[PDB]
Chains A and B, each alone.
Chain A
Amino acid sequence: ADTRPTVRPRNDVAHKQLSAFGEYVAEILPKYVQQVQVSCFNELEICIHPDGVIPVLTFLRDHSNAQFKSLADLTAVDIPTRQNRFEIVYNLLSLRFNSRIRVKTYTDELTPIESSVPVYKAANWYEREIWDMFGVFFANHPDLRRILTDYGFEGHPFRKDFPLSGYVELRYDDEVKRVVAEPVELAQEFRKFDLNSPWEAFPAYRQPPE
């Protein structure tokens, strides 16, 4: 807390607790946890080897000091610049201790991740979505299939290399008396504005030379 209305007041106490709670999980499951980091806005991050999805998520759900009962969110972040392009992310809640932790893995198109449905029933559908939109496959999922896209969508939309306008646009044809599909044609193309400023914005995050 400080007397500056245009800045965000830091809460260091909660930040210290996460760092203290940091090694707590790094020591307990060192077979999987690769990297644990804490962000300045009080959010804990745990980096786990993909195999340890069940050992780590199952632990926090039930341990006597984690007690993360509810799964807040489950998604993936496509990143085509890495060998493991995709990157799962689990957001966990803890009513007892009133805190949230984020657990991340890494996979690709052809390396499935064990379904976490056994750990949480919440991920019954979130795992369908990730497969549906990104293409990652989940092993042992009770029922894996498309949840969002249209039937027979020959592609995985949310991948960064999937054009925004798709590949086929529908229309109704009288000759055949049924909706049809054709290669996409746009009356007006999507204008692609270039916004990046050519001057370094934040020196703190500067990536060192190569």
Chain B
Amino acid sequence: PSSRGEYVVAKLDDLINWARRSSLWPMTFGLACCAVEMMHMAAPRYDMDRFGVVFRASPRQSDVMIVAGTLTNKMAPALRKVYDQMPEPRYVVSMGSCANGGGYYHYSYSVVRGCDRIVPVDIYVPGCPPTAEALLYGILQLQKKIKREKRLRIWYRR
């Protein structure tokens, strides 16, 4: 066989970028109304599991966190704690409008104005609640966002 160093990296890099997106195990934070849609997205109609996205995973063996609902100041420390326990790679997805900018409760003293303050978010899903189909678009969108990752190529060019 024959191939340059760059080429072999891409193909074996393309593999992992496919494995790490064909099998996502999302931790779920059912904090508020938008938690319900997350259940529908797993319900029979859409069956998020049909894409490999399992329903339940140990928070310490997750693959992506979907912050769903409001993020109270009291509950904020717990969220950050959970975030640090996630093994890498860890992708955080903000779901809804209270998990993005405080939504309806932007001006509430006890509401964290956007979960992005507590952690770095990857995908932002609008809509309070985001229809169970829209949320599924974000997850599919996330897989592509993974698919546009070139770790090894950048490593080979260090």
Q: Residues of A with Cβ closer than 8 Å to B?
A: 149-151, 157, 162-167, 169-172, 178-179, 186-187, 190
Contact = CB atoms under 8 A, between A and B. Distances in A.
Given A149-B110, A150-B73, A179-B76, 19 more contacts: A149-B74, A150-B72, A151-B74, A157-B109, A164-B107, A164-B109, A165-B108, A166-B110, A167-B109, A169-B112, A170-B73, A170-B76, A170-B118, A171-B118, A172-B117, A172-B119, A178-B77, A179-B118, A190-B107
- DSSP class of A's interface residues: helix, strand, loop or mixed? loop
Contact of A150 (B74, B113, B117, B119): B74
Contact residue range for chain B?
10 to 19
B80 interface: yes
Contacts of A149: 74, 110
Nearest to A163: B109
Contacts of A166: 109-110
Given A150-B72, A150-B73, A151-B74, A170 B109 contact: no
11 contacts: A150-B73, A150-B110, A157-B109, A157-B110, A163-B109, A167-B109, A171-B118, A172-B117, A178-B80, A179-B80, A190-B107
